[PDB]
């Protein structure tokens, strides 16, 4: 009936008059950037990264002379967090890649496209990866900060929104002891494009129908050592945002209060992560707040947002714009 999916006979769709077309315009790629900014250390447990995290301090006592006071005990619970493997093979019939001499040119353009699809999913799953939903995937930044009731609920700042159409801004601090990704011992991080070599295949019929194959493993999960270093600005109604910091939620304060929420950004490095929609309204609103003060003729449009606190403000496409309200 329907017959897929090895890369076949529409290598014709990827050439000019000639060899594989180098200047193919990557339409579908989106350049969200958590992947560059995140730090990675090998997860320590068998398939989790266990973490002992302090639950209680000893309180001490004032003692009157000649009178021994009770000993104290520092209580401390642990929390572990898992991984998920994200991988695909990419087989091509060997004859198809070799012809018109484009074995490596083809292998390459299909490779670039792979790396791109992989960053796309790793990045969307890093924010909305539920392990209780997806079963398979590691759990991301939601819904670790989901309910306002969770004991780290104070770290999510309610934008004051409602309706179904609403974003969130993230602010993290990526570093070995506050928030990082983890890869297993010892499958290494982060995205291994291993080339399997040419190898024989089998026809559905049975003949050798012999060809290539490429692996693209990428297995990461996500340790949030302590939520104190991560803040969520949830329920930010996107329709109600206006450039005049007027209707809806002001970003410049919703963002500064986010900055004040982190206990001393000391290590390693913080970052804001917002949908491009937000980045645009953040920009408009900043030039608008300064407008009531001192903005020049030439800086009317405003310097594009780079470092807010300064903390880098990294654009992330792979970030849902109409997410259901979190209350």
């Amino acid at each position: 009936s329907t017959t897929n999916p090895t890369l076949a006979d529409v290598a014709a769709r990827m050439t000019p008059d000639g060899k594989i077309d180098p200047q193919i315009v990557e339409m579908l790629n989106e350049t969200n950037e958590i992947l560059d900014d995140m730090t990675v250390i090998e997860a320590n447990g068998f398939t989790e990264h266990k973490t002992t995290v302090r639950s209680g301090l000893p309180t001490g006592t004032w003692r009157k002379l000649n009178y021994g006071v009770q000993p104290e005990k520092s209580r401390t619970v642990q929390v572990k967090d898992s991984m998920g493997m994200l991988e695909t093979y990419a087989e091509v019939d060997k004859a198809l890649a070799d012809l018109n001499g484009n074995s490596a040119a083809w292998r390459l353009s299909e490779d670039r496209a792979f790396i791109e699809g992989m960053n796309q999913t790793q990045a969307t799953t890093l924010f909305y990866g539920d392990s209780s939903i997806d079963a398979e995937k590691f759990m991301g930044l939601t819904p670790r900060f989901n309910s306002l009731s969770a004991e780290n609920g104070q770290n999510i700042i309610d934008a004051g929104g409602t309706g179904s159409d609403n974003a969130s801004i993230w602010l993290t601090v990526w570093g070995p002891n506050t928030l990082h990704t983890i890869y297993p011992k010892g499958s290494q991080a982060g995205l291994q494009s291993r080339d399997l070599g040419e190898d024989t295949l089998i026809d559905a019929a049975g003949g050798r129908y012999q060809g290539y194959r490429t692996h693209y493993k990428w297995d990461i999960g996500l340790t949030l050592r302590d939520w104190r270093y991560v803040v969520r600005i949830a329920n930010v109604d996107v329709s109600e945002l206006t450039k005049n910091a007027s209707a809806g939620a002001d970003l410049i304060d919703l963002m500064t209060q986010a900055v004040e929420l982190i206990p001393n950004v000391g290590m390693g490095r913080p970052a804001f992560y917002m949908p491009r929609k937000i980045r645009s309204f953040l920009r408009r609103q900043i030039t608008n707040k300064v407008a009531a003060s001192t903005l020049t003729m030439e800086e009317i449009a405003g310097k594009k947002v780079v470092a807010f606190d300064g903390i880098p403000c990294r654009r992330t496409d792979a970030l849902l714009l109409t997410e259901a309200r979190v209350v």
Partner: protein, 140 residues
């Protein structure tokens, strides 16, 4: 959360009446006793939610058998209520310390019957569980 495709049981099963899991894990031995790995553990994850006429509870329970014929509880949870089975809730059962060949998952649904709700049961090593912990809590 890593998953062995073979230990996966009840992929996204609509548990409406008090029923058993679809799939049954057959270990290749009379007594795997996989609680002793002190690492394997059952998980029942939830989607989308425990909608029912209510108020109903779902007591998840692991069952062994000598042969794949009659099951018996070797682990249980207690009556997990509806409105604790929102999309996204790992209800963890530590692996019973004394397993037999052929383990399955029973969903003892206290009345009335659930109208909607899928569940994912599988043995993993081990869970993704990162509960939020206090801050001061004096400030703030």
């Amino acid at each position: 959360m890593i998953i062995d495709k073979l230990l996966q049981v009840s992929d996204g099963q609509a548990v409406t009446a008090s029923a058993a899991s679809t799939d049954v894990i057959d270990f290749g031995q009379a007594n795997p006793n996989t609680g002793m790995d002190d690492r394997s553990k059952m998980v029942i994850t939830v989607d989308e939610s425990a909608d029912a006429a209510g108020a109903a509870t779902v007591t998840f329970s692991v069952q062994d058998s000598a042969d794949n014929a009659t099951f018996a509880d070797v682990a249980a949870t207690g009556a997990i209520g509806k409105a604790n089975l929102a999309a996204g809730k790992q209800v963890v059962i530590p692996m019973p310390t004394k397993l037999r060949r052929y383990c399955r998952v029973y969903y003892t649904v206290a009345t009335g019957p659930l109208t909607a709700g899928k569940f994912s049961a599988q043995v993993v090593t081990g869970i993704q569980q990162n509960v939020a912990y206090p801050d001061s809590p004096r400030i703030a």
